[PDB]
Structure 1
Amino acid sequence: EFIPTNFEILPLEKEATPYPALIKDTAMSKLWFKQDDKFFLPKANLNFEFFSPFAYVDPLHSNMAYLYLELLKDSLNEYAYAAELAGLSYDLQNTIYGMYLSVKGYNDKQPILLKKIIEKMATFEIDEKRFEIIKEAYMRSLNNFRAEQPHQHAMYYLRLLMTEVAWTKDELKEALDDVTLPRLKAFIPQLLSRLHIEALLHGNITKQAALGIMQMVEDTLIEHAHTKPLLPSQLVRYREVQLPDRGWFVYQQRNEVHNNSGIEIYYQTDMQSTSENMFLELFAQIISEPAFNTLRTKEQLGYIVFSGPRRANGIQGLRFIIQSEKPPHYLESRVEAFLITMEKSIEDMTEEAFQKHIQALAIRRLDKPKKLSAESAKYWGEIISQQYNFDRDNTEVAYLKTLTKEDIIKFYKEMLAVDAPRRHKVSVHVLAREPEVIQNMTEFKRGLPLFPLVKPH
């Protein structure tokens, strides 16, 4: 029931910001807030990150976190679905860093519902055969990972190689022999003991009641297990590996199931500066549409052929996701033919190609939101990257029109040419069922540098 009365719209106050302001920061939590200006709807959306150290400590802890949230979902689904039937949808998911909480719906009863959600996932129990079915089930999903689509395989190996630490699915497979009820049951209060909160509150709501409810919530967190905040030195992130400025390295991975060869051709550009976002977006699109002309039709590589940006750890990147059944060096050679095609296709650009193209980028980028969850998802998508540049849109567009033909030529050469000093190229071969070598990826990653992080504005 939960008092479905108050659907009223709340008028905007003195805090007449168009972007979410950080209304509370502690060592326990960090709180951003934004009333709805454009839509004025009787709705609210809430997103929560619970940051905690125990997440990527070891493949065993990751499995336990998984199973925790997984069986947690299995526990609460039976209670939650009738309230979800009332028009309040949600999602619980995980991060490599922490936990992902979504609360979406009306303004009327999210405080009571979220209250009972916190009270519910605080005091948590395990059934035996339930644990076995879920265990076996994810065990299937794990050794299944030999049998999926090579574009996912390629993105998995790329996010393996180009992060700081990475636990393979093999280790995850072998370690499931030890997941016992007492071991998880020891793990559970340890995890929830000490953690960090981060929250998005967005809708026709107030700041003070948001602070009081959020306060109430973290006070309940302290009420259960005597929660203490985290230390501000263990809010670390994982950096990304610096290529030694010239290397073009490659290796191979042999699939077992699919008679298909994926391939991902990674390029380190740079951190997201304001110039580099528009460099990479515009250059990506200038190699986008002629690729639609030449790759499927003319070069006939495959059907799942993809190229483009990479947004991870605050670091930009360039990729070529292609799954087909080919020799990988043969496929690389026609990718290099496409690189020659785009290289001269730069220098053959008229003013017209340029102008239609930058207007294409413009309408590609420009759109007003259409629902509070969309804009809230973009803002959350900025809070997870800890950037907060709320008006990067206007600045990047204002920069975007201030480009020349020669502006991307000077962008092109040092990173992409064959005689290039800043060429950061690396590919990953995924084989079908039938530079330097990389023997041990730890010993590979041993003597390679690490990129800096972004200054928070």
Structure 2
Amino acid sequence: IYGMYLSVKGYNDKQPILLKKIIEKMATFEIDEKRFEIIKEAYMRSLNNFRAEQPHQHAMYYLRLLMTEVAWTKDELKEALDDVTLPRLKAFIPQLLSRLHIEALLHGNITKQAALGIMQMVEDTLIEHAHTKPLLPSQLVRYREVQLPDRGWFVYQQRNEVHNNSGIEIYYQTDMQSTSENMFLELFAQIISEPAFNTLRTKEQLGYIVFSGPRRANGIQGLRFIIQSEKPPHYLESRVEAFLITMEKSIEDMTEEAFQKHIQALAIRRLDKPKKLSAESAKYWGEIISQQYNFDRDNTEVAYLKTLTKEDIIKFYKEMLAVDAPRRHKVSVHVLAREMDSNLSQAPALPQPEVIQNMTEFKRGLPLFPLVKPH
């Protein structure tokens, strides 16, 4: 959504050669017509084939659409696809390349001089063949995430046309990333991690797919649940809310040490060393594309984690997650089975949800979060 991504990996003996051919071809590309028609046809089919994705992929997709300032739907792209001609693409390519900014991570068995060399080879190739000039600092747009109002609940409902199963995703948006908000949310996810599998899947058989954990996008974060089931969504909702309350009660009732076990387990996971080159590359690249550049984040966050108490999580929960929390921000995506119509612990009363009819109106009527500050 920001441009283009290129990654070359492997033995570096011949690596500058491959990279150089790619960039040369990138910047002077001439489209063969038969090939264009064929690949266009393939892309068209892949746009259509979305209706046959899994219910949970759908739920994630719609949540993505809902939460980003600007996001084009598969439908809009498909529709827009027919006005794509050979001339038009040929005209698009030089314009795309006329102004660029490049952010690169070069990591492995290479020297500083060789890195500078490679970088400068890329810059020079782009200048030579596409006449690229710099972009203005202010044109480096990042998109923000829709900021949900205190105490609101929104539902977005859609039908899966292929599968006779449902999917649900439930998102409790918390706030901007920072040391403490991150370890609170992560600790909570850690604590509820195994109880959720054992209750929601093994005992209650809510579905084959049952997932829970942190969601992070556009510098904001929160708690998400993804489930795929034969049972209808409103029931799934009620079971997740009941689970959440059982969980708060369980966190209140638990001893200091079980709590410290959760801390120690989250801690080892977070401080866990990359075991091969490309995993370390992945971590740093993650720090870079999000523009947070927090390369020492694991130690900071773990150090802070060890400081945390039962109290902290209890009040976090009371502020942000409980059904009557002063800052609850809940959005739910319901993907209905083709056919569905529109003992156990006690499910709490939920407010009347607001049903979202139109994404643009929904977005227009809400604030946007800041972007996260670098380091």
Normalised by the length of structure 2, the TM-score is 0.94
Structure 1 residue 286 displacement after superposition: 0.6
Structure 1 residue 109 displacement after superposition: 2.2
Post-superposition CA distance 1:199-250 (Å, at most 9, x none) = 1111232212321331122011110121111011100111111112121111
Q: Find the aligned partners of 2:35 and 2:110 in 1 and give their Cα distance.
A: 40
8 Å Cα contact 2:207/2:229 also seen in 1: yes
Structure 1 residue 113 displacement after superposition: 2.3
Structure 1 residue 321 displacement after superposition: 0.4
State the 4+ residue runs in structure 1 displaced beyond 6 angstroms.
none
8 Å Cα contact 1:304/1:324 also seen in 2: yes
**Which SS does the other structure have where 1:240 is aligned?**
coil
Q: Find the aligned partners of 1:319 and 1:244 in 2 and give their Cα distance.
A: 17
Structure 1 residue 284 displacement after superposition: 0.4
8 Å Cα contact 1:162/1:240 also seen in 2: yes
Q: Find the aligned partners of 1:424 and 1:273 in 2 and give their Cα distance.
A: 18
* Aligned residue in 2 for 1:118: 23
Q: Find the aligned partners of 2:158 and 2:326 in 1 and give their Cα distance.
A: 29
Q: Find the aligned partners of 1:117 and 1:250 in 2 and give their Cα distance.
A: 45
8 Å Cα contact 1:203/1:372 also seen in 2: yes
**Which SS does the other structure have where 1:378 is aligned?**
helix
Structure 1 residue 325 displacement after superposition: 2.1
8 Å Cα contact 2:271/2:299 also seen in 1: no
* Aligned residue in 2 for 1:337: 242
Q: Find the aligned partners of 1:331 and 1:370 in 2 and give their Cα distance.
A: 38
Structure 1 residue 330 displacement after superposition: 1.3
Q: Find the aligned partners of 1:331 and 1:385 in 2 and give their Cα distance.
A: 33
1:438 equivalent to 2:343? Answer no
% identical aligned pairs:
100
Structure 1 residue 158 displacement after superposition: 0.4
Post-superposition CA distance 1:249-283 (Å, at most 9, x none) = 11310111111111111111111101111111110
* Aligned residue in 2 for 1:225: 130
8 Å Cα contact 2:183/2:305 also seen in 1: yes
The answer to which of 353-362 and 150-159 deviates more is 353-362
Post-superposition CA distance 1:290-317 (Å, at most 9, x none) = 1122111222100101111111111112
Q: Find the aligned partners of 1:155 and 1:395 in 2 and give their Cα distance.
A: 30
Q: Find the aligned partners of 2:169 and 2:148 in 1 and give their Cα distance.
A: 16
**Unaligned runs of at least 5 residues, structure 2:** 340-352
8 Å Cα contact 1:266/1:425 also seen in 2: yes
Structure 1 residue 388 displacement after superposition: 1.2
Please give the root-mean-square deviation of Cα atoms over the aligned residues, in Å.
Answer: 1.3
**Which SS does the other structure have where 2:284 is aligned?**
helix
**Which SS does the other structure have where 1:123 is aligned?**
coil
Q: Find the aligned partners of 1:322 and 1:359 in 2 and give their Cα distance.
A: 28
State how 1:25-64 maps to structure 2 within 5 Å.
none
Post-superposition CA distance 1:36-85 (Å, at most 9, x none) = xxxxxxxxxxxxxxxxxxxxxxxxxxxxxxxxxxxxxxxxxxxxxxxxxx
1:452 equivalent to 2:357? Answer no
The answer to which of 172-181 and 219-228 deviates more is 172-181
Structure with greater contact order relative to length (CA < 8 Å, sep ≥ 6): 2
8 Å Cα contact 2:155/2:356 also seen in 1: yes
* Aligned residue in 2 for 1:148: 53
**Which SS does the other structure have where 2:136 is aligned?**
coil
Structure 1 residue 361 displacement after superposition: 1.0
8 Å Cα contact 2:319/2:328 also seen in 1: yes
Structure 1 residue 363 displacement after superposition: 2.0
The answer to which of 284-293 and 106-115 deviates more is 106-115
8 Å Cα contact 1:248/1:426 also seen in 2: yes
Structure 1 residue 417 displacement after superposition: 1.4
8 Å Cα contact 2:245/2:322 also seen in 1: no
8 Å Cα contact 2:156/2:332 also seen in 1: yes
Q: Find the aligned partners of 1:115 and 1:137 in 2 and give their Cα distance.
A: 28
8 Å Cα contact 1:266/1:426 also seen in 2: yes
Structure with the higher fraction of residues in helix conformation:
2
8 Å Cα contact 2:215/2:221 also seen in 1: yes
8 Å Cα contact 2:28/2:130 also seen in 1: no
Q: Find the aligned partners of 2:249 and 2:154 in 1 and give their Cα distance.
A: 25
The answer to which of 143-152 and 360-369 deviates more is 360-369
Structure 1 residue 439 displacement after superposition: 2.2
Q: Find the aligned partners of 1:105 and 1:251 in 2 and give their Cα distance.
A: 44
Post-superposition CA distance 1:131-181 (Å, at most 9, x none) = 222122121111111111011101100000011012111112222222211
The answer to which of 157-166 and 428-437 deviates more is 428-437
The answer to which of 179-188 and 364-373 deviates more is 364-373
Structure 1 residue 444 displacement after superposition: 1.7
Structure 1 residue 381 displacement after superposition: 1.1
Q: Find the aligned partners of 2:123 and 2:156 in 1 and give their Cα distance.
A: 48
Structure 1 residue 129 displacement after superposition: 2.3
Q: 2:172 aligns with which of 253, 267, 271?
A: 267
8 Å Cα contact 1:414/1:422 also seen in 2: yes
Post-superposition CA distance 1:179-200 (Å, at most 9, x none) = 2111111111111111110111
Structure 1 residue 324 displacement after superposition: 1.1
Q: Find the aligned partners of 2:29 and 2:105 in 1 and give their Cα distance.
A: 25
Q: Find the aligned partners of 2:369 and 2:49 in 1 and give their Cα distance.
A: 34
8 Å Cα contact 1:194/1:228 also seen in 2: yes
Structure 1 residue 352 displacement after superposition: 3.0
Structure 1 residue 436 displacement after superposition: 1.5
8 Å Cα contact 1:299/1:334 also seen in 2: no
Structure 1 residue 355 displacement after superposition: 2.2
